[PDB]
Ligand binder design. Structure first.
Ligand SMILES: Nc1ncnc2c1ncn2[C@@H]1O[C@H](COP(=O)(O)OP(=O)(O)O)[C@@H](O)[C@H]1O
Ligand SMILES: [Mg+2]
Length: 296
């Protein structure tokens, strides 16, 4: 239903073999079709060409993101093979170039400023960030300073032995991402085979009216798919077909996110695609996966 699927093809980078210019076309409100090489033809909510900037990728979903201030759970995924651009889309560049910042700092910046607009209407908002890594039935805290288990509250789920950090500006958010990169660097003494799960608990409360609101925003940099992950697909289809049973428990990822998947949760699916000829085989896999989600 309220599932949006977006496709993103990254630019060809230095050193990489130059692909045939007809390997990927982008025919012609935003562009929506991707053509591989009768010729495989796909269609999505938006197809971002290689020249797409980070700011444009976020602007397409800014309004869906702020519904998480209105009690809607929002769950965003980056899916695709290793080297296709999942981490660039989610985190962005590691060097602090503001044009290369990804969805996590742009989402949080956008939330901070809608929240300040709404404070003149009597609202106060609180934001609590966590960041955890799921590698083969193990959970590590990417925000450790300085064993983790997915546990219950009621019925909420948290991660034990993980930091839950109140954030209120862009610098505190950036510092958490840089800490995540430090902890990954130390762990070398892996992340291509791991889900990275960024969560922000949003609490709102009105001053003179007896109103409160609350919702999780999740930004998920999935493990690479090549050649855990299959369980996510199974969980998404079970909900599409209104199955009496949904097997959240079959993976630590769906078990953690089970309350941000069904129900009224808005779900955003970015499929990252490698432009290269050598990767045409895994690109087809990722595009079929995305085509399947978009019909669910
Ligand atoms: N949209 C993009 N524009 C420019 N460079 C990109 C883009 N997406 C990915 N890259 C580059 O491609 C390489 C692989 O990206 P990465 O996000 O690490 O892949 P993944 O997380 O999917 O394994 C990185 O060097 C990154 O800088
Ligand atoms: Mg990555």
């Amino acid at each position: 239903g309220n599932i949006r699927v977006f496709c993103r093809v990254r630019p060809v980078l230095p050193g990489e073999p130059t692909p045939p210019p007809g390997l990927l076309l982008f025919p012609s409100d935003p562009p929506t079709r991707l053509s591989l090489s009768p010729r495989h033809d796909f269609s999505f909510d938006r197809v971002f060409p290689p020249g797409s900037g980070q700011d444009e990728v976020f602007e397409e979903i800014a309004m869906l993101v702020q519904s998480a201030l209105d009690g809607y759970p929002v769950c965003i995924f980056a899916y695709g093979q290793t080297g296709s651009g999942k981490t660039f889309t989610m985190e962005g560049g590691p060097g602090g170039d503001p044009q290369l910042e990804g969805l996590i700092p742009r989402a949080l910046r956008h939330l901070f400023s809608v929240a300040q607009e709404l404070s003149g209407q009597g609202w106060t908002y609180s934001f609590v960030a966590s960041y955890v890594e799921i590698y083969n039935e193990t959970v590590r805290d990417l925000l450790a300073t300085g064993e983790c288990e997915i546990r219950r509250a009621s019925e909420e789920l948290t991660v034990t032995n993980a930091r839950y950090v109140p954030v209120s500006c862009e610098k505190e958010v950036d510092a958490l991402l840089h800490l995540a990169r430090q902890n990954r660097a130390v762990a070398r003494t892996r992340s291509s085979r791991s889900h990275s799960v960024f969560q922000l608990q949003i609490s709102g409360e009105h001053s003179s009216r007896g109103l409160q609101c609350g919702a999780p925003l999740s930004l998920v940099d999935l493990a690479g798919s090549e050649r855990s992950l299959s369980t996510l697909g199974l969980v998404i289809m079970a909900l599409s077909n209104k199955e009496s049973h949904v097997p959240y428990r079959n993976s630590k990822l769906t078990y953690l996110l089970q309350n941000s998947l069904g129900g009224s949760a808005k779900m955003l699916m970015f499929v990252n695609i490698s432009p290269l000829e050598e990767n045409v085989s895994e690109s087809l896999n990722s595009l079929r996966f995305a085509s399947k989600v978009n019909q669910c």
